[PDB]
């Protein structure tokens, strides 16, 4: 009489402040009632990180590498103010940084689209997934600036002229990129495309940077033809290179539903549009097995201060919920678990349908009709909305 799904091995990381409260509600109301998990829980709360000297963060990373699926709640990155607040032993490095450094791979951002919530481009009815991949100095006066390559094998040194400053000074800088980095970026991008069953596009400026950006185009094409092209044709999808100039135009005339590898912020645009609560951030390792899913937003400290004073809050849980669904969706693919695959999709649909039915948090109401025009009847508080998702999920899974 359990009735629940066998989810398998999932690494879970608890976080800080407002997201921590929402994270517990998601597990209690949306996940645990329907899914049984071999759950590897790690508390990346600031207090426990301080208590363990950030050893919990390193253990969490090694656990993700072993079990292949990670879902992470937003965490506090210590600054000077945070050290004084919690009396921290040290100004600990960003947990995200530590995890990224150990796992590696490419970060991919995906917005959640609802038909009753406006978009930057109204034509975009399906999400677009964006994947992102120096020594500068002042030239005091006239002189020759050159960039030189000295081979490790002790063969002849090669020299290239950057610019000869004949009158006056200016600035100069050198950039670089290793082949291994570009290969990893390509693999991750192809893995993501097959995982989602959408076509992939790489954008560069290879007309201008014929060698530098040319290397990106070449390495992508080589790896595609030799390893991935057959698997893409099997799912009726494709990979193509585009010039950034053409890609922007094509992307905006498109209706979305494709992967975009970008050689070059996505967050700033989301902040400007006020849609941080509706964007997820998945780290995809190039091995094709390991994945770490989380919200693109932080711990929402401002909202937490109101919660601490016992005031009503309306914090958007969709980004946090979709971190779970993307993680479980990947678990389902690795294990060929069609029951879990269905649940992951079902929860995503319930979430969108609930907002499309008119039930949403304050940020979404403000997005529709502007923040000044929002009244209390236009939206639900953090707990009311989670309850409404809970009721709608029970009905969908019963059907």
Ligand X SMILES: *CCS(=O)(=O)NC1CCN(c2ccc([C@H](C)Nc3ncc(F)c(N4C(=O)OC[C@@H]4C(C)C)n3)cc2)CC1
- C-alpha span between 318 and 347 (Å, rounded): 10
What's the half-sphere exposure (Cβ side, CA atoms, 13 Å) at 40?
Answer: 20
Site size for ligand NDP, by CB under 6 A? 19
CB of 98 to ligand NDP, least distance (A): 12
Q: Which stretch binds ligand X (CB under 6 A): 37-45, 212-220, 232-240, 272-280?
A: 272-280
Considering only residues 48, 77, 271, 345, which one is a binding residue for a copy of itself as defined by CB under 8 A?
A: 271
Closest separation in Å from C-beta 394 to a copy of itself: 37
Question: Mask of contacts with ligand NDP, 56-95, x by CB under 6 A?
Answer: ------------------xxxx------------------
Among 165, 273, 359, 383, interactor with ligand X by CB under 6 A: 273
Cβ-proximal residues to 255 (8 Å cutoff; 6+ apart), any chain:
123, 124, 125, 126
Answer with the entry of ligand X, a copy of itself, ligand NDP, none that 80 interacts with (C-beta below 5 to 8 A by kind).
none
Q: Which of 20, 40, 72, 109 binds ligand X (CB under 6 A)?
A: 109
Q: CB of 280: closest distance to ligand X in angstroms?
A: 9
Which of 96, 195, 203, 325 is in the footprint of ligand NDP by CB under 6 A? 96
d(CA 32, CA 26): 9
What residues contact 320, with CB distance under 8 A and at least 6 apart?
19, 22, 23, 26, 73, 74, 295
Q: For residue 28, what are the CA distances in angstroms to 34, 137, 335, 348, 390?
A: 10, 54, 24, 17, 10
Which tokens hold the place of 215? Answer: 């290397």
Q: Which is nearer to ligand NDP, 76 or 223 (CB)?
A: 76
Residues 51-90: x where in contact with ligand X by CB under 6 A, - otherwise, as a string: ----------------------------------------
> Quick one: 82 or 119, whose CB is closer to ligand X?
119
User: Please, which residue, 123 or 197, has the CB nearer to a copy of itself?
Assistant: 123
For residue 181, state whether it binds a copy of itself (rule: CB under 8 A). Answer: yes
Q: Which of residues 20-59 bind a copy of itself (CB under 8 A)?
A: none
Q: What is the CA radius of gyration of the chain?
A: 24
- Which is closer to a copy of itself, CB of 232 or CB of 260? 260
| Other C-beta atoms lying within 10 Å of the C-beta of residue 55 | 11
Question: What's the closest the beta carbon of residue 263 comes to a copy of itself, in angstroms?
Answer: 11
**186 is written with which tokens?**
């390509």
The CA distance from 359 to 40, in Å, is: 33
CA distance 169 to 87: 48
> Which residues within the stretch 258-317 sit at the binding site for ligand NDP (CB under 6 A)?
271, 276-277, 294, 297-302, 315-316
Of 97, 3, 13, the C-alpha closest to 324 is 13
Both tokens of 166, joined, read 């004949």
Site string for a copy of itself, 287-306 (x = CB under 8 A): --------------------
Backbone angles phi, psi at 165, to 5 degrees: -75, 105
């Amino acid at each position: 009489m359990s009735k629940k799904i066998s989810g398998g091995s999932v690494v879970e990381m608890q976080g800080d402040e407002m997201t921590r409260i929402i994270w517990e509600l998601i597990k209690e109301k949306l996940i645990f009632p329907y899914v049984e998990l071999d759950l590897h829980s790690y508390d990346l709360g600031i207090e426990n990180r301080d208590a363990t000297n950030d050893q919990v963060t390193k253990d969490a990373a090694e656990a993700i590498k072993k079990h292949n699926v990670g879902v992470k709640c937003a965490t506090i990155t210590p600054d000077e103010k945070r050290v004084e607040e919690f009396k921290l032993k040290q100004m600990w490095k960003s947990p995200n940084g530590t995890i990224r450094n150990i796992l590696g791979g490419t970060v991919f951002r995906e917005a959640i689209i609802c038909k009753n919530i406006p978009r930057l481009v109204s034509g975009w009815v399906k999400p677009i997934i964006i994947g992102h991949h120096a020594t500068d100095f002042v030239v005091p006066g006239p002189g020759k600036v050159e960039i030189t390559y000295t081979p490790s094998d002790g063969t002849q040194k090669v020299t290239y002229l950057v610019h000869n400053f004949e009158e006056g000074g200016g600035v100069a800088m050198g950039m670089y990129n290793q082949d291994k980095s570009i290969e990893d970026f390509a693999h991750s991008s192809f893995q993501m495309a097959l995982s989602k069953g959408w076509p992939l596009y790489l954008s560069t400026k290879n007309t201008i940077l014929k060698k530098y950006d040319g290397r990106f185009k070449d390495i992508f094409q080589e790896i595609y033809d030799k390893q991935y092209k057959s698997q893409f044709e099997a799912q009726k999808i494709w990979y193509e290179h585009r010039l950034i100039d053409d890609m922007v135009a094509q992307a905006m005339k498109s209706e979305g539903g494709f992967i975009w590898a970008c050689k070059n912020q996505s967050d700033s645009v989301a902040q400007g549009y006020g849609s941080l609560g509706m964007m997820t951030s998945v780290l995809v390792c190039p091995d094709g097995k390991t994945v770490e899913a989380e919200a693109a937003h932080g711990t929402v400290t401002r909202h937490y201060r109101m919660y601490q004073k016992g005031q009503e809050t309306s914090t958007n849980p969709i980004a946090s919920i979709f971190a779970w669904t993307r993680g479980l969706a990947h678990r389902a693919k690795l294990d060929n678990n069609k029951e879990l695959a269905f649940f992951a999709n079902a929860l995503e649909e319930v979430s969108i349908e609930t907002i499309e039915a008119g039930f949403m948090t304050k940020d979404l109401a403000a997005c529709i009709k502007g923040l000044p025009n929002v009244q209390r009847s236009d939206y639900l508080n953090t707990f009311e909305f989670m309850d409404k998702l809970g009721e709608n999920l029970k009905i969908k899974l019963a059907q």
